[PDB]
Amino acid sequence: ASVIKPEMKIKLRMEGAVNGHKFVIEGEGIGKPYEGTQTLDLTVEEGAPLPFSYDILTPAFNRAFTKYPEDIPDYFKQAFPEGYSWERSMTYEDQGICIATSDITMEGDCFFYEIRFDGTNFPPNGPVMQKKTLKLIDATEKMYVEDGVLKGDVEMALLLEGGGHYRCDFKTTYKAKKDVRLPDAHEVDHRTEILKHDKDYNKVRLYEHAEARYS
C-alpha cells in the first residue's frame, strides 16, 4: 500500500511476565517492507537482567516486513494505515507456554507496536530458564484464511547448546482493522538472528528476513 514507504521506522513497547519475572522492553528500528527485512534495537527497561532465554521473545518483536509476490494478496500491507493486531499461542515441548499479542498502528513513516508477552510453566532447570538456547532455527509459517482472518501455523525449534532441538508449535491469528483482499493459502519463510547484544541481553540488536511464496 502506497502508505507503506520503502523504508519504515519502528517503535515498540513490550510488557510481560515469564515464570513470575515481570519485565518491560522497548525498541526502535528500521526496515524495508517490500524486501522483507528489518532491524530492531531493543532495551530492557524494567526487570533487568532477564533470567530466561531471549530467544522466546524474538518473534514477538510485524508481517508488514515480508516480501510478497505480486500474485499473493498482501494481507498486512493492505491493512494500513489503520493497521492490524495479532494474537499468538506458543507451546513448547516441555510444556512451557506463552501467549503474546501485538497492536500495530502507523503514523507518517513509523510503525508503532504495543506488545504483551506472558509465559509460564517453564521447568526451572529447562533450557529456557537456564538460558541454554542458541538461536531460532529457520522456519516456514503456513498462512491460511479461517474465520474471515489470516492465520499462521508454525512448527519450529530453538537450537540448544549441545546441538539438541527444542520444539515449539505456535499459531497466530492476524486481524486487519479493515476489510482487505484475503490471500489463498501460502507460506512465509523466516530467518531470525540476534546480531549483537551486551552481556545480560539488556541491549539486543535483532534481525529478521521473511519472504512469502506458494508451495
Descriptive account of the structure:
By secondary structure, the protein is mainly beta. The protein has one domain: Green fluorescent protein (Green Fluorescent Protein). Helices cover 2% and strands 57% of the residues. The chain is built from one helix and twelve strands; from the N terminus they run βββαβββββββββ. An eleven-stranded mixed beta barrel has the order 1-2-3-12-11-8-9-10-4-5-6. The chain is globular, with a radius of gyration of 17 Å. The two termini are 25 Å apart.
Architecture blueprint of SSEs:
Elements (H helix, E strand, L loop, with lengths): L7 E11 L2 E12 L4 E10 L28 H4 L5 E9 L4 E11 L2 E11 L12 E4 L2 E8 L2 E12 L4 E12 L9 E12 L5 E11 L2
Parallel strand pairs: 1-6
Antiparallel strand pairs: 1-2, 2-3, 3-12, 4-5, 4-10, 5-6, 7-9, 8-9, 8-11, 9-10, 11-12
PDB class: fluorescent protein
Keywords: Thermostable, Cyan, Fluorescent, fluorescent protein
Assembly: monomeric
In CATH, the homologous superfamily goes by the name Green fluorescent protein
CATH architecture: Beta Barrel
Q: Encode the helix/strand succession as letters.
A: EEEHEEEEEEEEE
Report the radius of gyration as a whole number of Å: 17 Å
Task: Give the biggest beta sheet.
Answer: 11 strands, mixed, barrel
Q: How many beta-strand elements?
A: 12
By secondary-structure content and strand pairing, the structural class works out as mainly beta
Q: For this structure, what is the CATH class?
A: Mainly Beta
**Tally of structural domains:** 1
Termini, distance in Å?
25 Å
What is the global morphology? globular
Give me the number of helical elements: 1
Into which percentage range does the β-strand content fall? over 45%
PDB class: fluorescent protein
Keywords: Thermostable, Cyan, Fluorescent, fluorescent protein
Assembly: monomeric
Entry title: Cyan thermostable protein (CTP) 0.75 at pH 7.4
